[PDB]
Amino acid sequence: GSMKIDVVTIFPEYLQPVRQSLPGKAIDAGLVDVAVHDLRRWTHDVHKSVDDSPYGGGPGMVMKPTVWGDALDEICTSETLLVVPTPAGYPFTQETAWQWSTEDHLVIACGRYEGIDQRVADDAATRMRVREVSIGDYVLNGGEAAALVIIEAVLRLVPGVLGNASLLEGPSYTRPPSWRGMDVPPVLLSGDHAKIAAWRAEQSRQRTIERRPDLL
Amino acid sequence: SMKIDVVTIFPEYLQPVRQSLPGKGLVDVAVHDLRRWTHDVHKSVDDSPYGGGPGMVMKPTVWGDALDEICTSETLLVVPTPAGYPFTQETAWQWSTEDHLVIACGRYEGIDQRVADDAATRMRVREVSIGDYVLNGGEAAALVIIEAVLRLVPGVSLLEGPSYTRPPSWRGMDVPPVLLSGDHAKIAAWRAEQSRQRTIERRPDLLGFDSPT
Numbered sequence: 001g002s003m004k005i006d007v008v009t010i011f012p013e014y015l016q017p018v019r020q021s022l023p024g025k026a027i028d029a030g031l032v033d034v035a036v037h038d039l040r041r042w043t044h045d046v047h048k049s050v051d052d053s054p055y056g057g058g059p060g061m062v063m064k065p066t067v068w069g070d071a072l073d074e075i076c077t078s079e080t081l082l083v084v085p086t087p088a089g090y091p092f093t094q095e096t097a098w099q100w101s102t103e104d105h106l107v108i109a110c111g112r113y114e115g116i117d118q119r120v121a122d123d124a125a126t127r128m129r130v131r132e133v134s135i136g137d138y139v140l141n142g143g144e145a146a147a148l149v150i151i152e153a154v155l156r157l158v159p160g161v162l163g164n165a166s167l168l169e170g171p172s173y174t175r176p177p178s179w180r181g182m183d184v185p186p187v188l189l190s191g192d193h194a195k196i197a198a199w200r201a202e203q204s205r206q207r208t209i210e211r212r213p214d215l216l
Numbered sequence: 217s218m219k220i221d222v223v224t225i226f227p228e229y230l231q232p233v234r235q236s237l238p239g240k241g242l243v244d245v246a247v248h249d250l251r252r253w254t255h256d257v258h259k260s261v262d263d264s265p266y267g268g269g270p271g272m273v274m275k276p277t278v279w280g281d282a283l284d285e286i287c288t289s290e291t292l293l294v295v296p297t298p299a300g301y302p303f304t305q306e307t308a309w310q311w312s313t314e315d316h317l318v319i320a321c322g323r324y325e326g327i328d329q330r331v332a333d334d335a336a337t338r339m340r341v342r343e344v345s346i347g348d349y350v351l352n353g354g355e356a357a358a359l360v361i362i363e364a365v366l367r368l369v370p371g372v373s374l375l376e377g378p379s380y381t382r383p384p385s386w387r388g389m390d391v392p393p394v395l396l397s398g399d400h401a402k403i404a405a406w407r408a409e410q411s412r413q414r415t416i417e418r419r420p421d422l423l424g425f426d427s428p429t
């Protein structure tokens with residue numbers, strides 16, 4: 001219904017595309033508010049440091065717990081659902097999106113480098129609900145693109161926000177009826193709607209077997 | 217060297233590409249407004265589905281004209297769709313050595329199937345899903361695919377366990393003492409146990425076990 005989303009990142013301009021995709025009517029009706037915060041506002045030093053070397057050695061850098069702790073202390077409450085994107089997370093799915101779509105307050109903590117010192121999420125989980133999640137079986141450079149995916153999948157399930165209204169879906173067609181020597185399947189122009197439904201069901205079955213045998 | 221062209225009716229949503237990777241002289245990225253290839257005064261790129269159903273389908277005519285101009289026989293045409301083959305880390309490795317990616321971004325209920333079918337007669341075509349959830353458009357999927365590919369371009373299993381940095385004690389929470397010990401063998405062993413434990417809990421499928429619920 002009415003949702004606030006706060007995103008914390010060292011690249012706040014990355015999140016401009018979705019602030020723009022929000023219909024004015026939804027904002028004016030008080031249905032949604034998305035705010036983006038530069039993590040460097042909570043740094044301690046003149047060099048605005050957000051990362052440091054990993055304990056135990058190895059390549060890369062780790063984001064600092066003292067900076068992230070201060071940021072989340074200010075932005076979160078006991079009622080916040082804290083979302084931490086990570087390729088080592090639980091899978092984010094359509095079920096997850098439906099569940100989160102009724103939340104009052106999401107906070108998304110975007111990592112870079114090797115990620116965030118684990119004590120940040122572990123400390124937060126002693127006083128709010130925390131969810132570490134992966135958006136797929138690949139490695140991104142940062143959490144910003146993951147935040148864009150999560151925000152879009154969730155907000156399209158909130159009535160009236162983004163301006164929109166198993167087996168895989170089969171192919172779709174529209175005008176013109178013939179194009180570059182390819183005709184639309186004649187069954188779709190037949191006016192036999194029980195037959196059309198059966199044809200679509202079989203197309204779905206075939207596509208699922210070919211592309212996603214795991215779903216069977 | 218890689219060229220990536222992205223085609224969309226919302227070119228503005230792709231502004232963040234100025235941050236998708238450091239590689240952006242190793243890789244050039246260009247964004248194109250699909251409506252530039254309409255002749256219409258209304259520039260209508262969609263209509264109701266044959267056979268019925270909710271929503272609208274993007275017409276093949278406009279897509280055909282755009283791809284005719286942008287693609288060659290060497291192009292790998294990428295078409296995001298939740299009904300696609302899965303896009304995975306193996307896919308990103310495969311695409312990292314391509315000369316030319318073109319990403320065709322859908323809106324509404326997607327693109328007339330004849331666009332991909334026609335394209336496949338002159339070039340390689342890949343319909344792919346980035347995960348088991350539904351987006352409103354292909355633009356966010358294009359940003360994900362570009363990020364995953366560009367960090368693998370030349371010139372640039374299990375779940376990773378937790379990471380830590382200074383200070384060694386924070387809010388009464390200590391960094392695991394083994395990580396401070398300087399013993400490489402014990403640290404490597406501890407990190408291995410951590411990775412396997414996290415994988416059993418969060419992604420049992422990766423180790424060949426049933427998925428939860």
Ligand SMILES: Nc1ncnc2c1ncn2[C@@H]1O[C@H](CSCC[C@H](N)C(=O)O)[C@@H](O)[C@H]1O
Nearest residue numbers: 085086087111114115134135140142143376
């Ligand atoms: N598949 C994915 N899903 C969600 N976030 C991802 C992601 N891949 C990368 N990220 C984001 O990008 C950041 C850097 S990648 C971090 C790599 C780390 N060694 C690890 O495996 O955990 C992550 O902290 C996360 O915010």
Ligand SMILES: Nc1ncnc2c1ncn2[C@@H]1O[C@H](CSCC[C@H](N)C(=O)O)[C@@H](O)[C@H]1O
Nearest residue numbers: 169296297298322325326345346351353354
């Ligand atoms: N999981 C996902 N992976 C990749 N692209 C996706 C996606 N979810 C939505 N999209 C994009 O968003 C657009 C609208 S979703 C419409 C697709 C259609 N109803 C079907 O089921 O096949 C798609 O054309 C695709 O470009």
